[PDB]
Amino acid sequence: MENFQKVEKIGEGTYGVVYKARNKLTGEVVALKKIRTEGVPSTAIREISLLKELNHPNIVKLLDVIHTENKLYLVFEFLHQDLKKFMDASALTGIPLPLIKSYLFQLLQGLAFCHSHRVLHRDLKPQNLLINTEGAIKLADFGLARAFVTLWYRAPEILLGCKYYSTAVDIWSLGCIFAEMVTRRALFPGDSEIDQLFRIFRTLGTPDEVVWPGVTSMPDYKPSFPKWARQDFSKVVPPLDEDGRSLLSQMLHYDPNKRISAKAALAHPFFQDVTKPVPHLRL
Ligand SMILES: Nc1cncc(Cl)n1
């Protein structure tokens, strides 16, 4: 669009290309997202406009929505790095625990806010968690999945065909990201839906009616699933301490009604000693 000078292709997102651009009437540097045709659905336009009001320090600001020439562009605040690259950058040492804790705490604050207004992300992953030089982390693309690819962070209720899923799906994803920050490997790197489900089962045990009432009646559940025994969390995420492991287990409860809420996770003892360190980042 005419008011924006693209400076660089930053990536191919879920919905289209993401550019770093500069606005000419403000001089502001932004992330420009092209979405994707019938002439942009009217409901998607209405959903997106609700998102313009969903403002929080831990949510990447939706600056503008440009519906022009029957195309849709989302203009976001720009951040220089994402958690995926920072994790790759931090592979030999690992992200220090104080920083992991600060990031998780801030992300939960973001989720708690969105969840309080009944907005889910649905597709959390390291690539859409954006970090700055101030030690802040922010959720990008919040609300876009409902308004409009890796399986690694997808909740089991989604994999099992539950169509009416809750905010709990975001808590699952963030637990997976938390484990990954700690161990420097992805928790459940599935490369198909069955492989994702079966990786989850191999670590947390195949779910049954005892841990997850109603599970065997879910659309894609099969009596023929193999029955793996649950592994111990001390084997899954060493050398995370007892507080972190305790929290992680609650974030990874099979039953979405049992799974910890963002708001209850913020009160967890793990965060008793949270701080806000600044990361070392080269831009
Ligand atoms: N890659 C980027 C940078 N800033 C904001 C967004 Cl939404 N994406």
Side-chain angles (χ1 to χ4, degrees), residues 147-165:
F148 300 128
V149 179
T150 190
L151 273 30
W152 291 7
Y153 308 99
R154 189 169 294 179
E157 60 264 40
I158 298 183
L159 271 9
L160 289 171
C162 181
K163 49 259 286 167
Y164 299 115
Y165 34 82

Side-chain angles (χ1 to χ4, degrees), residues 181-218:
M181 282 195 287
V182 162
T183 63
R184 328 178 205 157
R185 287 293 167 76
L187 225 199
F188 306 126
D191 64 357
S192 67
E193 281 185 71
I194 201 61
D195 179 67
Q196 189 67 38
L197 205 52
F198 282 6
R199 281 169 178 280
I200 295 163
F201 296 179
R202 283 167 198 120
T203 295
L204 278 26
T206 300
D208 59 20
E209 287 291 332
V210 177
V211 295
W212 193 353
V215 68
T216 60
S217 307
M218 295 183 85

Side-chain angles (χ1 to χ4, degrees), residues 23-258:
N23 183 324
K24 300 178 206 159
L25 61 123
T26 62
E28 184 56 80
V29 161
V30 303
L32 213 252
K33 300 200 176 184
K34 310 203 174 327
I35 305 303
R36 312 310 180 176
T37 165
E38 355 283 18
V40 195
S42 81
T43 53
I45 294 285
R46 274 106 139 184
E47 287 276 15
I48 289 151
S49 297
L50 296 166
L51 302 183
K52 211 176 313 202
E53 273 18 293
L54 185 78
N55 298 132
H56 179 100
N58 293 118
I59 294 175
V60 179
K61 192 174 167 51
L62 179 56
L63 269 27
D64 295 285
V65 177
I66 300 165
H67 187 209
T68 278
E69 248 62 43
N70 285 58
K71 281 295 299 92
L72 197 52
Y73 303 95
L74 314 180
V75 189
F76 286 102
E77 83 174 282
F78 181 83
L79 290 91
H80 290 80
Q81 192 155 155
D82 68 48
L83 186 63
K84 173 75 174 173
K85 301 190 299 295
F86 187 63
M87 293 187 85
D88 291 352
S90 303
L92 288 300
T93 49
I95 304 162
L97 181 68
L99 189 60
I100 286 166
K101 192 176 283 184
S102 172
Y103 282 173
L104 179 62
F105 184 73
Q106 291 179 63
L107 293 174
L108 288 156
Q109 285 169 72
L111 294 187
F113 176 74
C114 293
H115 290 355
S116 72
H117 301 85
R118 303 147 223 103
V119 181
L120 331 186
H121 188 106
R122 202 225 147 274
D123 194 25
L124 292 181
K125 67 186 103 171
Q127 306 89 278
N128 59 37
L129 305 181
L130 303 187
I131 64 169
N132 68 17
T133 48
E134 307 299 340
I137 189 150
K138 309 192 181 207
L139 300 128
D141 300 353
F142 226 102
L144 264 26
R146 175 212 38 211
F148 300 128
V149 179
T150 190
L151 273 30
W152 291 7
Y153 308 99
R154 189 169 294 179
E157 60 264 40
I158 298 183
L159 271 9
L160 289 171
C162 181
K163 49 259 286 167
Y164 299 115
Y165 34 82
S166 72
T167 51
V169 306
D170 290 337
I171 289 292
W172 181 274
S173 301
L174 189 51
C176 290
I177 295 169
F178 176 26
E180 187 174 348
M181 282 195 287
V182 162
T183 63
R184 328 178 205 157
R185 287 293 167 76
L187 225 199
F188 306 126
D191 64 357
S192 67
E193 281 185 71
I194 201 61
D195 179 67
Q196 189 67 38
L197 205 52
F198 282 6
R199 281 169 178 280
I200 295 163
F201 296 179
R202 283 167 198 120
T203 295
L204 278 26
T206 300
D208 59 20
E209 287 291 332
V210 177
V211 295
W212 193 353
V215 68
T216 60
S217 307
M218 295 183 85
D220 300 328
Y221 176 92
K222 316 280 169 189
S224 60
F225 288 154
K227 295 152 158 202
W228 284 282
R230 180 180 188 85
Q231 304 307 140
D232 218 274
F233 268 52
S234 62
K235 186 191 183 181
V236 179
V237 288
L240 192 60
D241 67 50
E242 198 68 60
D243 289 320
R245 284 185 272 128
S246 173
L247 181 52
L248 180 59
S249 63
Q250 296 184 285
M251 295 179 79
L252 261 26
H253 274 153
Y254 272 120
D255 187 340
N257 302 99
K258 291 185 190 72

